């Protein structure tokens, strides 16, 4: 927890000897820093005089000379395709089912039903004449419950916290602090 | 289609009475075997007979007064390009793209 820290543990120029004793007596908060960076510590090796020998970092699976076929990591050309669902295809999915739960007849009898949804088929007409259990199981969820808008992050919860934890303003200030929970 | 949409576009009248646009499909470059650029229809404007380019004497810059010199519209179909040009009331002309004649090509023909 980011509690108070003594002044000598902060990388700022401070007072010495008698002038340090005087500062502690007169300052309301003696542990605060003056904000002047330490001349002997801050930026003492300048970026142009660093002794570090830099090397380009490379990962093994994607930056090696072996077992590194590019198409195995070519995510840009394996982008998701853009698919739009109109009322004709939704009616087909509702009437014939999906490939996950097929409800379409077999053989030539099944291809007749598929060719129905190759032209305009209104969804309202499909809903008008259809078994209601299909709507309660495919279009709706949990036996007819409405489909709630899906969350962008299911782990976005919060919990109310008190001053002893978050260290912010006490309860008499008109703001509150929510943690991750 | 028949609506004169140029009355509300805000463009100056010189685009109609003084400038000519070309509707064309880009020809395949002779230095490359790719044909991607030839799949779209484009519209550009003919250069001004004077003031299209002149040399600035201070630095040798290419000065110009044609505000349409760098505008090239992109269309997916020829009909869309014609419909847009007609809608804006532009004076245009279409350059029909050249089509390559198909000739059979086989390795056996190198000896027969």
């Amino acid at each position: 927890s980011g509690g108070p820290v003594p002044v000598f543990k902060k990388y700022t120029t401070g007072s010495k000897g008698i002038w340090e004793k005087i500062r502690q007596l007169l300052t309301l908060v003696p542990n605060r820093s003056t904000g002047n960076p330490l001349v002997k510590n801050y930026r003492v090796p300048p970026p142009g005089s660093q002794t570090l020998k830099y090397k380009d970092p490379v990962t093994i699976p994607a930056g090696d000379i072996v077992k590194n076929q590019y198409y195995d990591r070519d995510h840009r050309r394996n982008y998701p395709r853009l698919v739009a669902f109109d009322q004709t295809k939704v009616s087909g999915l509702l009437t014939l089912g999906s490939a996950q739960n097929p409800r379409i007849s077999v053989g030539e009898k099944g291809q007749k039903e598929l060719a129905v949804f190759d032209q305009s088929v209104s969804l309202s007409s499909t809903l008008a004449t259809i078994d209601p259990k299909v709507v309660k199981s495919e279009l709706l969820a949990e036996g007819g419950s409405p489909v709630v808008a899906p969350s962008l992050n299911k782990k976005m919860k919060f919990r109310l916290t008190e001053e002893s934890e978050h260290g912010m303003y006490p309860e008499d200030y008109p703001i509150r602090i929510f943690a991750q929970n | 289609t028949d609506l004169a949409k140029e009355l509300v576009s805000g463009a100056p009248k010189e685009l109609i009475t003084e400038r000519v646009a070309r509707i064309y499909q880009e020809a395949k470059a002779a230095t490359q075997s790719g044909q991607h650029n030839t799949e779209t229809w484009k519209i550009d404007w003919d250069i001004l007979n004077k003031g299209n380019r002149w040399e600035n004497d201070l630095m040798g810059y290419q000065s110009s007064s044609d505000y349409m010199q760098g505008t090239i519209l992109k269309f997916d179909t020829r009909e869309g390009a014609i419909r847009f040009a007609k809608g804006q009331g532009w004076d245009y002309y279409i350059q029909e793209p050249k089509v390559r004649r198909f000739v059979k090509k086989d390795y056996s023909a190198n000896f027969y």
Binding site: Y70, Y71 | S33, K105, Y107
Partner: protein, 218 residues
């Protein structure tokens, strides 16, 4: 005489004896190529157009393999992707790092097809170095930088068959094979300069146009 073949699940129909690379273009499928030109004789010396015939254990060059009825052609399987990267690596093994000083920079087929179909990284770290080839003098029109040639024989095929000038050919064997006229002479043809357009790389370039512009400016 039409044959109904398949290219990546697309029905195609062309005249009998047509190459697979011709049927692929009619089907809208793009196959990389260096040595194939739709106006020159068929060569198979570049191996960039390799495709996988459905029932065959061998990869066929689409520019030379004739079409058959019922033939199904795959052009984007991982096996072909391996072949394209492998052939690209071989082409760029000895190619000089000349793009900044090479007039084909912005209109190079070797650059674009290596970017599109080759890998993003090279593995040639040899200390012996690349092949070095001296520049041939064939007149004031065609500028030669023969380090950049990929031995595709477009110039040889054009000048012998189309232009009708047989003084240009391939001399040598193996890695020491050099395009040129062997002896010190020029190319005598009113259509010789078309060799500059046909050369996909900067090996043959326009001498009057040298260094003066980049294609994206024009």
């Amino acid at each position: 005489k039409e044959v109904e073949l398949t290219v990546d699940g697309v029905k195609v129909s062309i005249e009998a004896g047509s190459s697979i690379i011709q049927a692929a273009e009619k089907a809208g499928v793009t196959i990389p190529r260096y040595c194939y030109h739709e106006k020159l004789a068929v060569a198979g010396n570049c191996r960039m157009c390799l495709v996988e015939i459905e029932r065959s254990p061998k990869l066929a060059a689409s520019c030379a393999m004739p079409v058959q009825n019922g033939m199904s052609v795959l052009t984007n399987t991982p096996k072909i992707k391996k072949a394209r990267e492998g052939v690209t690596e071989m082409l760029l093994e000895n190619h000089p790092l000349d793009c900044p000083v090479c007039d084909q920079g912005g209109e190079c087929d070797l650059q674009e097809q290596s970017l599109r179909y080759g890998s993003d990284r090279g593995r040639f770290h040899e200390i012996v170095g690349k092949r070095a080839v001296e520049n041939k003098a064939i007149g004031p029109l065609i500028k030669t930088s023969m380090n950049r040639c990929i031995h595709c024989t477009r110039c040889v095929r054009f000048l012998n068959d189309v232009a009708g000038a047989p003084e240009f050919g391939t001399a040598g064997r193996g890695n020491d094979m050099q395009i040129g006229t062997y002896v010190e002479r020029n190319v005598n043809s009113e259509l010789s300069a078309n060799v500059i357009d046909l050369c996909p790389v900067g090996a043959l370039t326009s001498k009057p146009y040298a260094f003066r512009a980049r294609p994206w400016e024009l």
